[PDB]
């Protein structure tokens, strides 16, 4: 009797995440108040098995 077993397992995984937050506020002496804030998020995941 001869017997062979070959098992290969490969797992790959990537997670990326970006976060930008930009604020700008021009605050005069109770005459003009101009405030601007922008946000940006980006999450990616990628898992590959075999």
């Amino acid at each position: 009797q001869e017997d062979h077993v070959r098992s290969s397992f490969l797992l790959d995984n990537q997670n990326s995440q970006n976060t930008v937050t930009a604020s700008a506020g021009i605050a005069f002496l109770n005459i003009v108040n101009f405030k601007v804030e922008t946000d940006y998020i980006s999450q990616t995941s990628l898992t590959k098995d075999y």
Binding site: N33, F34, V36
Partner: protein
Amino acid sequence: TELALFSRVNGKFSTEFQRMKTLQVKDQAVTTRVQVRNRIYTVKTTPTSE
């Protein structure tokens, strides 16, 4: 965005965009082959046959 002019004219403007995406691929391929071969007897004619 916020904007206050003359401490009387107020304005706000808040937007938000959110996109989520998901993909999944799952493949399986199973192949089984069984092969049995029994050889029991070898039957021959006697050379003195008629």
